[PDB]
Amino acid sequence: SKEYHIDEEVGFALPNPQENLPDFYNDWMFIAKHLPDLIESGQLRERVEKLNMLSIDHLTDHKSQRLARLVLGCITMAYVWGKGHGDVRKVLPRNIAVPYCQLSKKLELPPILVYADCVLANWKKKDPNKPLTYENMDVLFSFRDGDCSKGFFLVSLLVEIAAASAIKVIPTVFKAMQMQERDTLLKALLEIASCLEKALQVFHQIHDHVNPKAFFSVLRIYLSGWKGNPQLSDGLVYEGFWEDPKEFAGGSAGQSSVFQCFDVLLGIQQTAGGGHAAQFLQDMRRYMPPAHRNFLCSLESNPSVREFVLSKGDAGLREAYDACVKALVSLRSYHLQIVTKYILIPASQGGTDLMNFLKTVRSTTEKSLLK
Ligand code: HEM
Ligand SMILES: O[C@H](C[C@H]1c2c(F)cccc2-c2cncn21)C1CCCCC1
């Protein structure tokens, strides 16, 4: 891989994300790292409006720019949702709204917290000399004490990182088809199947670090957007940048590039046909970092791995390809069970539209098998 901002150790996630901003922005960093206290004490929204308007120009690097996106993205969800009990702000104050908006446009991302903010850039190792495992890692920002945002964000990230092992194999696959190296391609496909199988065990960590009640009744609220949302029917007003209200989707792992890229690699056309599911995953590419959505584009313009394997009448190649697809079905099926426990059952003591989305996506993946 190249300038697509993909790391051989960490994948689509951002290696060594920046923890501190320049001292120009302590009024921002102060609010973001005390979100639990300021929300509970009802002091958050006033401290948003007591801020003055800071320029973007002192955010020099890519890392500081993305950390500043994480900082302002969190404050925005906190300001808009408050303590998450239904009273919402519809006007985002200018002294935070235009710095957020100008920064979002420099990074080609929408002015709302996305996956690449709160997962791919929201982490750090405790001891930098020990490995990437849950016990040596922490998030940088949370919303409320007990919101399980750390468990939820880190376990996502750990799955993203398990998938990095398979991403570095992708160039091997295409070179092998181009150079007509069937044994090379067979081994490459088995290697990708093996990685997707290992990423399944990483999902099991979710049960030890997230509990359904807190996730459903707290974290979910701070991840909500203002598109198709009854509470903000027309969107949100970004003071002093636009005057119209604007609607942007809440956080979704449909914004994760790692499952989209394996759908594209294998020729599982998740974005084909005029269904809501295909529509939503295409729209969510606008909420990916431009470098990552460029990488999905260049995979799509390479010749299809699926029809290469079909064109050959090769049981070995067909079995290896189906191994990868079976492993994707396994992840989405385990993930579907997670959603039953963490959304469907809590909601019972909406969710059906979410299950139906995942089931459409799993059903498409299942239909891509050969034998
Ligand atoms: C408490 C744990 C989790 C819950 C309740 C949950 C729930 C959901 C829901 C409701 C969706 C619907 C689409 C959307 O709005 O994003 C979704 C999609 C998705 N989730 Fe999760 N999720 C959880 C954990 C994870 C983890 C750890 C990953 C690791 C990467 C992950 C990966 C995905 C992906 C890739 C999608 C897009 C659909 C697909 O490609 O199959 N999820 N999830
Ligand atoms: O699935 C998204 C949340 C999303 C998400 C983030 F917004 C941030 C970090 C990880 C994830 C995630 C992982 N799987 C789904 N999602 C929400 C949809 C509405 C119900 C609550 C979950």
Curated annotation (Swiss-Prot):
Cofactor comment: Binds 1 heme group per subunit. In the active form, the heme iron is in its ferrous state Fe(+2). The catalytic cycle does not alter the oxidation state of the heme, but IDO1 is prone to autoxidation.
Cellular component per GO, a single term: cytoplasm
Annotated localization: Cytoplasm, Cytosol
Expression triggers: By IFNG/IFN-gamma in most cells. Exogenous inflammatory stimuli induce the expression of IDO1 in antigen-presenting cells such as dendritic cells, macrophages and B-cells.
Endpoints of the signal sequence: none
UniProt keyword list: Cytoplasm, Dioxygenase, Heme, Immunity, Iron, Metal-binding, Oxidoreductase, Tryptophan catabolism
Gene3D superfamilies: 1.20.58.480
Cofactor needs: heme b
InterPro entries according to UniProt: Indolamine_dOase, Trp/Indoleamine_2_3_dOase-like
Tissues expressing this chain: Expressed in mature dendritic cells located in lymphoid organs (including lymph nodes, spleen, tonsils, Peyers's patches, the gut lamina propria, and the thymic medulla), in some epithelial cells of the female genital tract, as well as in endothelial cells of term placenta and in lung parenchyma. Weakly or not expressed in most normal tissues, but mostly inducible in most tissues. Expressed in more than 50% of tumors, either by tumoral, stromal, or endothelial cells (expression in tumor is associated with a worse clinical outcome). Not overexpressed in tumor-draining lymph nodes.
Swiss-Prot/TrEMBL catalytic activity: D-tryptophan + O2 = N-formyl-D-kynurenine; L-tryptophan + O2 = N-formyl-L-kynurenine
Gene Ontology annotations of biological process type: 'de novo' NAD biosynthetic process from L-tryptophan; female pregnancy; inflammatory response; kynurenic acid biosynthetic process; L-tryptophan catabolic process; L-tryptophan catabolic process to kynurenine; multicellular organismal response to stress; negative regulation of interleukin-10 production
GO molecular function: electron transfer activity; heme binding; indoleamine 2,3-dioxygenase activity; metal ion binding; tryptophan 2,3-dioxygenase activity
Activation/inhibition comment: Activity is inhibited by and MTH-trp (methylthiohydantoin-DL-tryptophan), modestly inhibited by L-1MT (1-methyl-L-tryptophan) but not D-1MT (1-methyl-D-tryptophan).
Residues at which heme b binds: 335
Pathway where it operates: Amino-acid degradation; L-tryptophan degradation via kynurenine pathway; L-kynurenine from L-tryptophan: step 1/2
Catalytic activity, EC: 1.13.11.52
Entries under PANTHER family matching the protein: INDOLEAMINE 2,3-DIOXYGENASE, INDOLEAMINE 2,3-DIOXYGENASE 1
Extra remark beyond the main annotation: IDO1 is the target for therapy in a range of clinical settings, including cancer, chronic infections, autoimmune and allergic syndromes, and transplantation.
Assembly information from the UniProt record: Monomer.
Protein role: Catalyzes the first and rate limiting step of the catabolism of the essential amino acid tryptophan along the kynurenine pathway. Involved in the peripheral immune tolerance, contributing to maintain homeostasis by preventing autoimmunity or immunopathology that would result from uncontrolled and overreacting immune responses. Tryptophan shortage inhibits T lymphocytes division and accumulation of tryptophan catabolites induces T-cell apoptosis and differentiation of regulatory T-cells. Acts as a suppressor of anti-tumor immunity.
Protein family according to the UniProt entry: Belongs to the indoleamine 2,3-dioxygenase family.
Name used for this protein in its record: Indoleamine 2,3-dioxygenase 1
Classification of source organism: Eukaryota, Metazoa, Chordata, Craniata, Vertebrata
Gene behind this protein: IDO1
